[PDB]
Amino acid sequence: VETFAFQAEIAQLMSLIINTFYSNKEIFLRELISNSSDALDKIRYESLTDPSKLDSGKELHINLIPNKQDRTLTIVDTGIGMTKADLNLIAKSGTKAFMEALQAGADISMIGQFGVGFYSAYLVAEKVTVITKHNDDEQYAWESSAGGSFTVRTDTGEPMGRGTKVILHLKEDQTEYLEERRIKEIVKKHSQFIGYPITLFVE
Ligand SMILES: Cc1cccc(Cc2n[nH]c3cc(O)c(C(=O)N(C)c4ccc(N5CCOCC5)cc4)cc23)c1
C-alpha cells in the first residue's frame, strides 16, 4: 500500500469543501457522472482507430448503485479507465482558479468549470474509493478520507474489465443519496442529456 501527500492546494480545496457551509450538496452527482461521460467519450474515440480497445467490454454505460447496508453510493462506468500513472491527474491551475473565483463571488456549484469537480464528492462522503482498470495496466484502488493523504494499491477485488468505479462512503447525515426517488430527481435535474445509459440499481 503506497501513501501519498496531496499537493498543498488540493488539501486546501478539500478542507474548503468539507468545512464550508453549503446546502446544495446534490451537485456532487452531476460532477461524477460528467467525469464518467468524459472517460466514455475517450474510449469511444480511441476505439475508432483501434477497435481491439473494446475487447475488455463493448458496452459504454454508467451504473448508479446504492447500498444502504454499507452506506455507499457507487458510480460505475465502462470508460477508458486510468493507468497507475494516469491515476498525473495539472489540477493545480484549476484549483487556484476555482479558489480565486470563490473569493470573487462564485459558488461551489461552479467547481466543474475548473476541472476539479471530483472533489465535490467530499460534500457527501467521509471516504472515497476509486477502483480503475485501463487496457494498458492492472486494476488499482485509490482511496482518501482527506486529511492531506491518499493511498494507492493493486486491487485484488472483482475484475472490472475496463473503466472506473467511484465508491462514496457517505457521511451519516447524507443517506438521502441512497434513496431511489432522490437519485432519480438529481439525475433528471442535472444529468438528463448525458450521451450514455445511466441505470439506477434497486436494492
Ligand atoms: C481519484 C481520481 C484520480 C483521477 C481522476 C479522478 C476523477 C474521476 N471521478 N470520476 C471518474 C470516472 C472516470 O471514468 C475517470 C476516468 O477513468 N478517467 C479516465 C477520467 C475522466 C475524467 C477526468 N477529468 C474530467 C474533467 O476534469 C479533469 C479530470 C479524468 C480522468 C475518472 C474519474 C479521481
Side-chain angles (χ1 to χ4, degrees), residues 31-32 34-40 42 77 79-82 86-87 89 112 114-119 130 132 142 163-166:
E31 299 308 325
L32 295 179
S34 182
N35 291 359
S36 292
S37 182
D38 291 350
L40 286 160
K42 192 168 191 200
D77 67 63
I80 192 128
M82 292 177 284
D86 293 337
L87 190 62
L89 287 145
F114 304 93
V116 289
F118 167 75
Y119 296 100
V130 177
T132 193
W142 174 104
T164 295
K165 164 161 62 192
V166 176

Side-chain angles (χ1 to χ4, degrees), residues 15-125:
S15 293
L16 182 147
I17 289 165
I18 292 165
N19 295 331
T20 299
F21 182 73
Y22 184 71
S23 303
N24 183 214
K25 294 175 180 282
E26 71 186 40
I27 67 100
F28 79 91
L29 192 57
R30 176 188 66 203
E31 299 308 325
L32 295 179
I33 289 176
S34 182
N35 291 359
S36 292
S37 182
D38 291 350
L40 286 160
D41 282 348
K42 192 168 191 200
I43 187 74
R44 189 177 57 175
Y45 167 79
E46 291 200 10
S47 82
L48 293 172
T49 53
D50 195 351
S52 77
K53 282 177 185 181
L54 293 173
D55 288 347
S56 52
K58 298 175 194 76
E59 220 194 326
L60 301 186
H61 59 58
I62 301 170
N63 295 160
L64 305 180
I65 311 172
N67 185 314
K68 286 170 183 175
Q69 105 180 20
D70 301 344
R71 204 166 83 202
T72 60
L73 173 64
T74 298
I75 298 89
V76 191
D77 67 63
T78 52
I80 192 128
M82 292 177 284
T83 63
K84 191 182 183 194
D86 293 337
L87 190 62
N88 282 329
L89 287 145
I90 191 69
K92 182 173 186 74
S93 60
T95 302
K96 179 181 174 77
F98 177 49
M99 283 179 318
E100 284 171 338
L102 290 172
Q103 273 285 98
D107 78 281
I108 285 162
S109 73
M110 290 153 100
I111 189 168
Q113 293 178 59
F114 304 93
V116 289
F118 167 75
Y119 296 100
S120 70
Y122 290 91
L123 290 169
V124 299

Side-chain angles (χ1 to χ4, degrees), residues 1-7 10 14 84 87-89 118-119 122 128 141-153:
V1 179
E2 291 180 301
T3 299
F4 302 87
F6 278 110
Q7 283 240 256
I10 293 291
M14 296 176 73
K84 191 182 183 194
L87 190 62
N88 282 329
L89 287 145
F118 167 75
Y119 296 100
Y122 290 91
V128 178
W142 174 104
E143 187 171 74
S144 183
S145 295
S149 71
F150 64 89
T151 67
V152 178
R153 71 200 72 188

